[PDB]
Amino acid sequence: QCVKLNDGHFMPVLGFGTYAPPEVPRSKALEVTKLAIEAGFRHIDSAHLYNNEEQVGLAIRSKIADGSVKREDIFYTSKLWSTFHRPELVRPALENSLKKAQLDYVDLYLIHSPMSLKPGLSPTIFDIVDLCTTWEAMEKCKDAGLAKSIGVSNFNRRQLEMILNKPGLKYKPVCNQVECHPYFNRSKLLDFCKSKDIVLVAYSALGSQRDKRWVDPNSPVLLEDPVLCALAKKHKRTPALIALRYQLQRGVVVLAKSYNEQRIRQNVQVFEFQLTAEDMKAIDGLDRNLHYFNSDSF
Numbered sequence: 001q002c003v004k005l006n007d008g009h010f011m012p013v014l015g016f017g018t019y020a021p022p023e024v025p026r027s028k029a030l031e032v033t034k035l036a037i038e039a040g041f042r043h044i045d046s047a048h049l050y051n052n053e054e055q056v057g058l059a060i061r062s063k064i065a066d067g068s069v070k071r072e073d074i075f076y077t078s079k080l081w082s083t084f085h086r087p088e089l090v091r092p093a094l095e096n097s098l099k100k101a102q103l104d105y106v107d108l109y110l111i112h113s114p115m116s117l118k119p120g121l122s123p124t125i126f127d128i129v130d131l132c133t134t135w136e137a138m139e140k141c142k143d144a145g146l147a148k149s150i151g152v153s154n155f156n157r158r159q160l161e162m163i164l165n166k167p168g169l170k171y172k173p174v175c176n177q178v179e180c181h182p183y184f185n186r187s188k189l190l191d192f193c194k195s196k197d198i199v200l201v202a203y204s205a206l207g208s209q210r211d212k213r214w215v216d217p218n219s220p221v222l223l224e225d226p227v228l229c230a231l232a233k234k235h236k237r238t239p240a241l242i243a244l245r246y247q248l249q250r251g252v253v254v255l256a257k258s259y260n261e262q263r264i265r266q267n268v269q270v271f272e273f274q275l276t277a278e279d280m281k282a283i284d285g286l287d288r289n290l291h292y293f294n295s296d297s298f
């Protein structure tokens, strides 16, 4: 099941989130991406920052080599890190990701964040670079066939308007990948994006990995919310399946990270049931402006 992007390419609506903290051995990324493909995931989300493009690439290549999937069936996303915003560092950063994953192209290449950082992963230091020139440098990557589609991540409406109003724009972003879950449902930004034929893609849709680095151990646990639990019991699914289903029904493409074999196979059940309009309204009622990640921390 895919959504048609504003450049005519197709994005599967359920994506596999690949970030794991650095204590997790790099071999697990290879193993779990194999299991995600086996389970039916076809959209795989990575980034230069994640230090796993070699192993996620190896997984995709492994499953093409054995005839499980064709390259054209996989939608692979990477992201341009903030130390590479300067327009001349963009095409080289993408070629580096392609070398690492040994792929010929990415289906999607994102500006990871609107912040720019001193060229060199977090030097300790910022750097004024015009996100609109960072964008023309992405656009060429699409012209060059190295990214089928281009988009952004962690942009608000103003920062999207900066690219959409750019004089001489050739390619709109196809998406804006942002934190998005029932405690922070982004309903205004989503309406804006819909009006511009920009797909919102939700990350931390399951409430985040609650990593000590960024997540206050006191903060509410999304998947223990009594609404998502009441809906889980009502449908005989799980709160994580209700959280994912919610996004699919409001026209959001959703990511789901899991490094656990049963949970990876469970997540693909999101396509087996639907939420009623009253169910959707109850989840809508959860909105509380809770950010599990704050780029101001990292």
Ligand SMILES: NC(=O)c1ccc[n+]([C@@H]2O[C@H](COP(=O)([O-])OP(=O)(O)OC[C@H]3O[C@@H](n4cnc5c(N)ncnc54)[C@H](OP(=O)(O)O)[C@@H]3O)[C@@H](O)[C@H]2O)c1
Binding pocket: 016, 017, 018, 019, 020, 045, 046, 112, 153, 154, 177, 178, 202, 203, 204, 205, 206, 207, 208, 209, 223, 238, 240, 241, 255, 256, 257, 258, 259, 260, 263, 264, 266, 267, 293
């Ligand atoms: N663009 C950015 O700036 C940005 C920022 C954050 C995230 N992302 C992307 O989005 C992905 C997902 O967000 P995230 O990593 O914060 O994780 P998440 O998808 O919000 O998942 C949170 C946790 O849910 C657990 N989980 C998964 N399926 C479950 C199920 N059926 N039942 C119960 N628990 C379940 C996972 O633990 P287990 O592994 O133990 O199953 C996981 O650690 C990332 O991996 C990354 O690819 C991007």
Ligand SMILES: Cc1ccc2[nH]c(C(=O)N3CCC(CCO)CC3)cc2c1
Binding pocket: 019, 047, 049, 082, 112, 113, 115, 154, 204, 208, 209, 210, 211, 293, 295, 296, 298
């Ligand atoms: C300045 C800035 C902006 C956007 C950013 N995005 C990420 C990112 O992608 N990661 C850190 C959060 C992790 C959450 C796991 O639950 C997943 C990976 C780091 C980062 C840093």
